[PDB]
Amino acid sequence: KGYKVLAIETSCDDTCVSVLDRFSKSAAPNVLANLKDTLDKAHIHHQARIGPLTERALIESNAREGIDLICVTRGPGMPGSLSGGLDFAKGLAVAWNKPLIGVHHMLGHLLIPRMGTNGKVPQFPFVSLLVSGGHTTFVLSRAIDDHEILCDTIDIAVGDSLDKCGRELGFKGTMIAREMEKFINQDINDQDFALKLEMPRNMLSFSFSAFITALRTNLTKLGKTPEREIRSIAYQVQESVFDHIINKLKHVLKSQPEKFKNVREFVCSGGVSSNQRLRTKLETELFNFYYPPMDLCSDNSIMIGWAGIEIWESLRLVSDLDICPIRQWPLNDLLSVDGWRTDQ
Ligand SMILES: Nc1ncnc2c1ncn2[C@@H]1O[C@H](COP(=O)(O)O)[C@@H](O)[C@H]1O
Numbered sequence: 393k394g395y396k397v398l399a400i401e402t403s404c405d406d407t408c409v410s411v412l413d414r415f416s417k418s419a420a421p422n423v424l425a426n427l428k429d430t431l432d433k434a435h436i437h438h439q440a441r442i443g444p445l446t447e448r449a450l451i452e453s454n455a456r457e458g459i460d461l462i463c464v465t466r467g468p469g470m471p472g473s474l475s476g477g478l479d480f481a482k483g484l485a486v487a488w489n490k491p492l493i494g495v496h497h498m499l500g501h502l503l504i505p506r507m508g509t510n511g512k513v514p515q516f517p518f519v520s521l522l523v524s525g526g527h528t529t530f531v532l533s534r535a536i537d538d539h540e541i542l543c544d545t546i547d548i549a550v551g552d553s554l555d556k557c558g559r560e561l562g563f564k565g566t567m568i569a570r571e572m573e574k575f576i577n578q579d580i581n582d583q584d585f586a587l588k589l590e591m592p593r594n595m596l597s598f599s600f601s602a603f604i605t606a607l608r609t610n611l612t613k614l615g616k617t618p619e620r621e622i623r624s625i626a627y628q629v630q631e632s633v634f635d636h637i638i639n640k641l642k643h644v645l646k647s648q649p650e651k652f653k654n655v656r657e658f659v660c661s662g663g664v665s666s667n668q669r670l671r672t673k674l675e676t677e678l679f680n681f682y683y684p685p686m687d688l689c690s691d692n693s694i695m696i697g698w699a700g701i702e703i704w705e706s707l708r709l710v711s712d713l714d715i716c717p718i719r720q721w722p723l724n725d726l727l728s729v730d731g732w733r734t735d736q
């Protein structure tokens with residue numbers, strides 16, 4: 393009366409494998425195993441570590457002969473990295489004679505806040521703001537298969553920009569932007585507010601490439617290291633970056649009011665979404681808000697597994713064993729591409 397899912401994420405630099413326990417359809421699934429091997433070349437890393445990782449996962453999950461579904465990121469991303477997990481997933485599927493689902497990567501980010509409350513919250517339609525180190529997108533979700541991008545970044549992601557500006561202040565570490573928030577919060581009022589920093593179609597867009605450039609052209613009028621000044625500058629940096637996002641979100645909500653007539657829930661996921669100041673400006677300068685945890689907003693295979701559970705039960709669809717990776721996969725063309733198949 394229940395089943396288990398083997399999930400593989402291989403679109404990014406980190407290799408991710410998970411085992412989910414869908415013990416009941418009237419309850420949120422549980423995680424039996426969730427591993428990430430960080431790249432610390434892209435196609436080789438997955439190719440060399442996808443094997444030992446899953447083996448380790450099946451041992452820890454204690455269910456090598458109990459998984460009933462294989463979910464793997466089909467795209468988008470680099471063909472070399474995607475293949476490493478996709479070809480491997482097929483091997484698992486053929487050996488176990490079990491169904492396979494080629495999952496869209498962005499679909500995982502959008503659907504993962506539902507998993508906690510099964511499929512209840514949030515409900516369609518809902519809007520989502522994916523703000524990570526690789527994504528900066530605003531998406532409308534009308535259905536499990538109907539997703540529309542309303543605003544996407546042009547150059548880099550917000551996380552990529554904040555880190556780049558964080559290393560110029562300069563902070564170090566795995567996640568630089570997260571560290572930059574701390575030094576500015578320790579002196580949230582204790583920082584000397586003396587510096588007045590200077591920061592800056594047929595489809596609305598984000599942009600973050602100029603923030604590092606504008607940052608360099610302001611430290612050139614001052615000096616490059618007073619913590620009362622450091623915490624002050626860092627505040628104005630993240631503020632203006634968040635200002636750009638809120639401004640573009642406003643433009644979207646004002647341009648297409650008909651799109652947003654029946655949505656009452658805003659989802660902000662991605663690594664950057666853990667930023668309290670960002671969370672605050674969203675709720676202030678804009679209808680519920682949902683903030684997914686940190687261990688799910690970052691790239692992982694759990695969201696891939698849950699996404700597969702979504703499409704297997706709701707759409708009753710499955711992927712053919714001949715599916716190839718997709719470099720550029722438009723979210724609106726989710727079911728347009730070969731080759732989906734029904735179990736219904
Ligand atoms: N609390 C935070 N505030 C701002 N940025 C963050 C925070 N936590 C993580 N990040 C950034 O999010 C990115 C990683 O998220 P992800 O790409 O989802 O793995 C990195 O650029 C981090 O610096």
Ligand SMILES: [Zn+2]
Nearest residue numbers: 524526527691
């Ligand atoms: Zn991602």
